[PDB]
Design a protein around this ligand. Structure first.
Ligand SMILES: [Cl-]
Ligand SMILES: [K+]
Lengths: 356, 355
């Protein structure tokens, strides 16, 4: 139903969106803080495990990863600019060949179409290279997540006297994960409708609070979008606020020391977003790779048809594919350029007890 | 000549501005990253010293300190809302007392003025408590800074064959400190619609040829007024200093660049130290002005008590009306800052001449 270039209009920003989300999730991990307070010796293992996750995120940043893959973005722009720089020449040849067929100009037209294949293959190579490095890192983050999750589960299983409050708290943290997923789905549905940019919101959820201010836990997570999304991010903040209010109600019978134990799985919110965002990137790059290959095959079929053309009628029927692809790649150039030149707009939202 | 409320129109946002700067300096500390690479045994001590500074920042934030003191802000809003809610009552009593001197109405007006004193004293108390906690924390950060600085100094002393490159690098790091100071000076000069605007810089040092680096040295600046021209000049300044560092380190291996660049780790810790001192200076000014306002209310309540004719009461209305007008502006500025969501940008500063 769609040409490859038409599909890429969706698949390219979909992949950039997934990468931007990972960047914001990484920031959420960095901005997750805990203090020992009066906690028993279990705290050392939680601190160690959390620091291991944070070390992986710092190494990802130190390796140069920011909002999206520069190599993939540059390859997209290379294809788009190859279309842009050859359009007048290609249309002039089509019109000349429409008037009078001659093999020399047909050979020149075929050579111009062929100049697309190197930038396309470069995009495929850079997607593969990026996804391999991403997956190698993601496996380490997943292992670090599982270790922290197991450490916390062991601690909470030993607190037999407050099991009901721990279960109720963990249900609210699961709801928060659902609310975050609902935000991402809402954004994805409205991406094609709005102007492009880089927008990030880092949340901090205050748990086990002190009366006079501050807390023992500041549980972070990060979300983002490549389109303005003030309404959706406000609904998410309202959702997380509601869930935190319910946690505070469910923990009303707990001391601050018990709240510290009962709230530990909020530390997984940040790294869970990293895990989910890594998987989303890889799914989007599998889709993108299939579509890029489809575009490569289209150019091969067009070149094959042009080489077989013996009259003007056979040459000009390839013009519809070209004109359609050029129009799509002109739009891809605008979107990719906007994202590549955008100044990221970041904000922070601290979520704490709302009702007193 | 300025009334205390007129002075507070400047002194209150001045203190808020100083607090917002400290948050951005703290963010720069948190976003300073190093990896060991092939570094020798000195790396453990640098990493431990840096982690000690970063732990202090995390503890400061876990104590509830973000962009500004919530206790001080809420006390400012408490005074402003006391003026707002009492205004119509006070103005009508002044008007009736003007027409005909009434003893009962005078005591009511006096009691309405006295209601200002409780929130004013709570502001003084909340300034003292915050500043005491700030100074206690700032002494820990200063001690942590000096330890990391001494560790770096000793490491750089032992690399005898590349002293020229280390001295040149440290000179440019000092230049960056002056360039940051120039931004904050320009901000203190230029008074538009308020907000919370923050920029976090990351300076790439000892880079890998294919991307990334062993050092990402952070620092942060901020303002409560938009300052796009000022932050653009700062970025251009920092970019030029980093380009000079890369030129001056061209003879160094990546391992040597790692050592030669270590003092960049002190950039945002140094900003924390400077910003803590600047907050305390602004809080001493603020506390003096708030005490001046408290004494103004004591002079007015005594004048209302000593008053025995109508003209003596209207004499105190000029103070009230002037105070109220200033505090309605303060309510608008404080509400804008208390309700603001931070507008944060980030800039990575790396070699930008080749590509
Ligand atoms: Cl656009
Ligand atoms: K409780």
């Amino acid at each position: 139903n769609q040409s490859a270039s038409e599909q890429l209009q969706t698949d390219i920003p979909a992949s950039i969106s997934a990468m931007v989300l990972l960047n914001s999730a990484c920031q959420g991990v960095v901005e997750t803080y805990i203090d020992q307070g009066n906690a028993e010796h279990w705290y050392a293992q939680v601190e160690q495990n959390l620091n291991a996750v944070q070390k992986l995120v710092r190494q990802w940043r130190l390796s140069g990863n920011l909002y999206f893959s520069n190599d993939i973005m540059d390859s997209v722009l290379s294809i788009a600019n190859t279309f842009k720089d050859s359009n007048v020449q290609i249309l002039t040849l089509f019109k000349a060949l429409e008037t009078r067929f001659d093999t020399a100009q047909l050979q020149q037209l075929t050579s111009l179409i062929l100049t697309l294949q190197n930038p396309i293959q470069s995009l495929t190579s850079n997607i593969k290279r990026y996804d391999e490095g991403l997956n190698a890192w993601a496996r380490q983050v997943e292992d670090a997540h599982n270790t922290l999750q197991q450490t916390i589960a062991q601690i909470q299983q030993e607190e037999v006297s407050i099991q009901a409050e721990i279960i109720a708290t963990n249900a609210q943290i699961d709801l928060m994960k659902q609310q975050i997923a609902a935000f991402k789905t809402a954004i994805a549905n409205a991406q094609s409708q709005r102007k492009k940019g880089i927008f990030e919101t880092i949340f901090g959820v205050v748990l086990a609070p002190f009366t006079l201010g501050g807390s023992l836990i500041l549980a972070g997570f990060g979300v983002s979008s490549i389109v303005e999304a003030q309404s959706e991010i406000s609904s998410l903040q309202s959702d997380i606020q509601s869930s935190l209010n319910t946690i505070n109600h469910d923990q009303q019978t707990l001391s601050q020391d018990q709240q510290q134990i009962a709230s530990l799985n909020a530390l997984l919110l940040s790294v869970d977003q990293v895990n989910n965002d890594c998987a989303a990137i890889s799914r989007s790059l599998d889709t993108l790779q299939t579509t890029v290959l489809s575009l490569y095959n289209e150019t091969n079929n067009v070149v094959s048809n042009l080489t077989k053309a013996q009259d003007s009628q056979a040459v000009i029927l390839e013009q519809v594919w070209y004109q359609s692809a050029y129009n799509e790649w002109q739009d891809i150039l605008e979107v990719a350029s906007t994202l590549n030149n955008a100044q990221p707009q970041i904000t922070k939202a601290q979520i704490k007890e709302n009702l007193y």
